Design a protein around this nucleic acid. Structure first.
Ligand SMILES: [Mg+2]
Ligand SMILES: [Mg+2]
Ligand SMILES: [Mg+2]
Ligand SMILES: [Mg+2]
Ligand SMILES: [Mg+2]
Ligand SMILES: [Mg+2]
Ligand SMILES: [Mg+2]
Ligand SMILES: [Mg+2]
Ligand SMILES: [Mg+2]
Ligand SMILES: [Mg+2]
Ligand SMILES: [Mg+2]
Ligand SMILES: [Mg+2]
Ligand SMILES: [Mg+2]
Ligand SMILES: [Mg+2]
Ligand SMILES: [Mg+2]
Ligand SMILES: [Mg+2]
Ligand SMILES: [Mg+2]
Ligand SMILES: [Mg+2]
Ligand SMILES: [Mg+2]
Ligand SMILES: [Mg+2]
Ligand SMILES: [Mg+2]
Ligand SMILES: [Mg+2]
Ligand SMILES: [Mg+2]
Ligand SMILES: [Mg+2]
Ligand SMILES: [Mg+2]
Ligand SMILES: [Mg+2]
Ligand SMILES: [Mg+2]
Ligand SMILES: [Mg+2]
Ligand SMILES: [Mg+2]
Ligand SMILES: [Mg+2]
Ligand SMILES: [Mg+2]
Ligand SMILES: [Mg+2]
Ligand SMILES: [Mg+2]
Ligand SMILES: [Mg+2]
Ligand SMILES: [Mg+2]
Ligand SMILES: [Mg+2]
Ligand SMILES: [Mg+2]
Ligand SMILES: [Mg+2]
Lengths: 70, 87, 116, 101
RNA sequence: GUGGGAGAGGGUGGUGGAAUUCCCGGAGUAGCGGUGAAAUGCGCAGAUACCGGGAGGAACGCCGAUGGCGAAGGCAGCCACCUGGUCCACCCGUGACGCUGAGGCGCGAAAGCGUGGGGAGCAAACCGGAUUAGAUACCCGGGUAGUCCACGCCCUAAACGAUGCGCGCUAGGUCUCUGGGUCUCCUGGGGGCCGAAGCUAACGCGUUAAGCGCGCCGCCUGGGGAGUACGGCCGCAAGGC
């Protein structure tokens, strides 16, 4: 495996309107990924959170999805 | 809020001489500005306790600067007081 | 006699029982089955075997009802939540996509003292 | 005054009578509440994650503004009363915090 | 003072999704539920499982941490506004303005009281089913206060770091949050863990002291009787000091 930010360009961590990127921070289901897999740091992750939830309200990133296989 | 304009107008108003930021007179006036603000906050918003505690501490501060002035210049303290509405 | 071809199957599973419900591609049910459906009575109901039998029964049912290819959705947890899945697999219905839908909430309701 | 970003998501099934009309009443609420406009971007028709007002998609708008702070909440009262607009989100701007930088 | 910074610190309006319940509709039978097993209970007036729509209340998954903020109690969706505290850098301003703080005054989980709302889930009392020699309990099915909101009381607690506040001093190593740096590292400021010297009856503590000191407040003087009695104050009461 590898972290998220390990492949990514310089990008606004506060910009909600950009889905293409934020998407890379969710799981197979809606759940925001943990530090371990997002390779961020405190202030980082903590920002990403609010960024994301802001986008969820604007109906871009999902509050949840379903899980294939199982 | 309060902006650097509101600040400066006050400071420059109470300056003992040009440039003084920290003298007693100035700190007391500045204080008093922020005091009277918080008064109007807790005029509505009475359910806000923690801001209130902050304002207690604030008045205890200005009172202590005044006790300093009075034991030091009786006059400057009188002028300060009458100028600001206090007592 | 709706003669329904390809369709969807809900497997609900709790620790106390299992229930399959076969339904049409937009969600209105067709047949259903459970541990009580087939002969089982008590605790015996939430065994995996009964889950096997349940699935199979609802499979035979839906097939004589004209079913062929099935998309499964699973809600819940308990023994033979998986056996119903292994059952539907080998049933003769064809398994399209198994999904897991188990609803979890965002903390709304204060759970029963048994569950806290 | 301060600087805000107003998001609007409204129903995709409109035509140009209706599009004109809603955009104008947006203008009206800004003029009335005193919000000068820095930029605007119309993102347009985009596929949401979850249905809003039973609708599988949405029509998106973004207005960077400045305005008197204390009326921003009433500004949103008005923008929300509008029936064909199903989300309003107004937020004060932030400096562009970066990462991987 | 100026310039930056972090935060579930507080208050007010607003709004977003998951879930539970409930009502409307569709489709569909004979059970569902629940337990060690069971029964009560609900279901042919059609439940359960499924799909669409509506109403309402409460709480905010993932992020979330061995994390943060707060004087304490305590604080967690998102937005906005009103506001408190705190930290770093600059070394600019006042020039001892300091520390502590008997009494007073205000805040103070939960439960509890009052008047008025509200009610989804939960749930003392209660009503039933069981289990046991018996069940006044654990387990099950219902359920009222209450839990939520507004205003006013109550003022307790393992209100716990069982460690009162302030300052100076006394090896390090390591993990972490948040500032500033010429950013392998250095430097403030919080949070943990090992451990110098030292301390301790031991356990342990050890620059977040329980070490070495100074100031100030609180408090202790065998166990039971007893946080009882009496008196006083406070409280609508419950009861508190
Ligand atoms: Mg059972
Ligand atoms: Mg609308
Ligand atoms: Mg400042
Ligand atoms: Mg907060
Ligand atoms: Mg708040
Ligand atoms: Mg709902
Ligand atoms: Mg019905
Ligand atoms: Mg009956
Ligand atoms: Mg009957
Ligand atoms: Mg529904
Ligand atoms: Mg109701
Ligand atoms: Mg967690
Ligand atoms: Mg605590
Ligand atoms: Mg602030
Ligand atoms: Mg100097
Ligand atoms: Mg001098
Ligand atoms: Mg002197
Ligand atoms: Mg209290
Ligand atoms: Mg209470
Ligand atoms: Mg009451
Ligand atoms: Mg109940
Ligand atoms: Mg009995
Ligand atoms: Mg019970
Ligand atoms: Mg003791
Ligand atoms: Mg001592
Ligand atoms: Mg702290
Ligand atoms: Mg440290
Ligand atoms: Mg340390
Ligand atoms: Mg140690
Ligand atoms: Mg030693
Ligand atoms: Mg020993
Ligand atoms: Mg020290
Ligand atoms: Mg010390
Ligand atoms: Mg004695
Ligand atoms: Mg007592
Ligand atoms: Mg006496
Ligand atoms: Mg009396
Ligand atoms: Mg008592």
């Amino acid at each position: 495996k590898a972290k998220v930010k390990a492949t990514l360009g310089e990008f606004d961590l506060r910009d909600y309107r950009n889905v293409e990127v934020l998407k890379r921070f969710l799981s197979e289901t809606g759940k925001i990924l943990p530090r371990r897999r997002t390779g961020l740091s405190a202030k980082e992750q903590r920002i990403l959170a609010k960024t994301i939830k802001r986008a969820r309200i604007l109906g871009l990133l999902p509050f949840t999805e379903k899980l294939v296989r199982k | 809020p309060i902006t650097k304009e509101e600040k400066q107008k006050v400071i420059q108003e109470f300056a003992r001489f040009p440039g003084d930021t920290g003298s007693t007179e100035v700190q007391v006036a500045l204080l008093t500005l922020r005091i009277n603000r918080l008064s109007e906050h807790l005029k509505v918003h009475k359910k806000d306790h923690h801001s209130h505690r902050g304002l207690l501490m604030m008045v205890g501060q200005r009172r202590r600067l005044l006790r300093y002035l009075q034991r030091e210049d009786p006059e400057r303290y009188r002028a300060l007081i009458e100028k600001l509405g206090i007592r | 006699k709706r003669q329904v071809a390809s369709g969807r199957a809900y497997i609900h599973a709790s620790y106390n029982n299992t229930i399959v419900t076969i339904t049409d591609p937009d969600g209105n049910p067709i047949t259903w089955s459970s541990g009580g459906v087939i002969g089982y009575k008590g605790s015996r109901k939430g065994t995996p075997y009964a889950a096997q039998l349940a699935a199979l029964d609802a499979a035979k049912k839906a097939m004589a009802y004209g079913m062929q290819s099935v998309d499964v959705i699973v809600r819940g947890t308990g023994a033979g939540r998986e056996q119903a899945i292994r059952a539907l697999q080998a049933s003769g219905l064809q398994v399209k996509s198994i999904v897991d839908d188990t609803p979890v909430p965002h903390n709304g309701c204060r759970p029963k003292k048994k569950f806290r | 005054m301060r600087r805000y970003e107003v998001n609007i998501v409204l129903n995709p099934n409109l035509d140009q009578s209706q599009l004109a009309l809603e955009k104008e009443i947006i203008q009206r609420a800004l003029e009335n509440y005193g919000a000068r406009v820095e930029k605007v971007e119309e993102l347009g028709l985009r596929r949401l994650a979850y249905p809003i007002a039973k609708d599988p998609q949405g029509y998106f708008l973004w207005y960077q503004v400045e305005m008197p702070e204390d009326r921003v909440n009433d500004l949103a009262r008005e923008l929300r009363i509008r029936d064909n607009v199903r989300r309003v989100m107004v937020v004060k701007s932030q400096e562009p915090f970066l990462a991987n930088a």
